[model samples]
Target: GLDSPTGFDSSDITANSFTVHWVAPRAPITGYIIRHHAEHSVGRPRQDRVPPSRNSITLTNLNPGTEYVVSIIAVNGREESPPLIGQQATVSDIPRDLEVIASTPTSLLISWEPPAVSVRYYRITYGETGGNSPVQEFTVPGSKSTATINNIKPGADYTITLYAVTGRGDSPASSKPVSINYKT
Candidate 1:
């Protein structure tokens, strides 16, 4: 008789990869079949076969900040046990299309495109170029993709960076920092 896997857990969740682990069945088994995909289907799902002794596997190349449903089944020859199902969401991706909409001597009006997946907030970090004396940060609500960072130094070069944030976690930094000089 085949026994369903137990103690299912998902960990190391990132924008593109996650690890799934389960307690191996006590009864004799030939192997296991694992399948997963975005909760809202668009195409074929991902599936893999693992030896009976293996209790963990990593899924990669997943969509950032997307929700997924994973199913695992213990197999014994031609027979298969009930599936063990799990749910998880990948972390968000970095913000995109970042630009300085407007700038002044002591303030900058910044705007950016949100990640493909939804996010709750955006964290922006800014400071003078090659200096940490006057570092500043701001959090913009997800509803508004724009922010005005004030209290900057006049006629000084600054480096700006941003990332999306959600309950899952923070995403990777933007492809690169946005550099510009605040002018009077």
Candidate 2:
């Protein structure tokens, strides 16, 4: 009488890989063990398994904007079912509709809209609005999704961000800071 692994889902979410669906636990099972762990860093849980007709799965190379809880358990013959949580898992290498214009007074014109996967470059940072780092940083390449950050600090007020390295390596730590004001 296994119970517990049901519904629980996720989406395509790119930047490394995403997509974990489920819903197959009425008692009859044979395999199913997709685990995960990454709320801070350094690979934690991480597991995978399938069978019982396969429900869904697509968690590969992950590590962009980290935030995975992906869990699911269900197996018969030996009886095992208790997992099956929910978080949908998705933080993906940050880089979705963004804009920080003012490409004059000092410089700054970052745009974004790339996230279906494929990111071999991207790493920008700015500081001047009360921060803990980035007095100045830049590293764009991923097909140049638009980037132009010159000597910003004219009218002050700054705080930019955008990171995405690809291959599930360095892009799931932080990337969500937008604040512009450099054209006085």
Candidate 3:
């Protein structure tokens, strides 16, 4: 006697951590497993599991400003249910402290504080003055307030937008048009 799998309960995100809960079926469910990974642009997702009857679990040590795709499955004696998926993002640890700090004529320096959870990396995008196609880029393994972007026209105007990203994806973007005035 097992109940069909439904959706997981919505929870809160604190600092860089998030707690999730699920409603248990009244019938005899053998176990439950949770699968998730820091959301990324490429490759398959990485997953983690939780034991059965464990109605709630907290995903901690996650990177700030990162989004995670989460899903839960219910299992009975010999079968597993389809997964229920959702997305999550962690907030920066610093108070109202997320922005792009510096951009020079030929380079840009981005400064940001860390978030409450673990942070994996940052993603940046930029383009030239006219109607040029924009480029998407990323930076990881950084441990400073500043990230310098080089290799650009010395006296050009570039529209730059960046995120304080984690191994997961970025939180809401810092801006729609993070433009920078560059000079040599």
Q: Best by lDDT, which number?
A: 1
TM-score of each: 0.55, 0.32, 0.46
Question: Candidate 1's residue-wise lDDT over 1-184, tens digit each?
Answer: 6679989888877667777889998887888898888868668888877787788887788877678888888888878887899897776576666778886778878887665455677777777766665567777678787888887777777777665566553543333334444433
Q: How well is each residue in 1-184 modelled by candidate 2, as lDDT tens digits? A: 6777666667776546778777786777788877776666556577787787888888778766667777787778677877776765565455676676446777767787776666677777776655446467777778677878776667767766656665544544334544444332
The residue pairs found clashing in candidate 1 are: none
As for TM-score, the candidate ahead, 1 or 2, is 1
Candidate 2 collision pairs: 65-172
Predicted candidate 3 versus true structure: per-residue lDDT over 72-154, tens digit per residue:
77777586665567676665443233345665667767665555545455555655676256554656465665667776676
Which structure among the candidates has the greatest TM-score? 1
Q: State residue 148's C-alpha deviation in candidate 1, in Å.
A: 15
Better of 1 and 2 by lDDT: 1
Off by over 4 Å in 2: 1-17, 20-29, 33-49, 52-56, 59-71, 91-113, 117-143, 149-181
- Consecutive 10-residue window with the lowest summed lDDT within model 1: 171-180
The model with the greater TM-score, 2 or 3, is 3
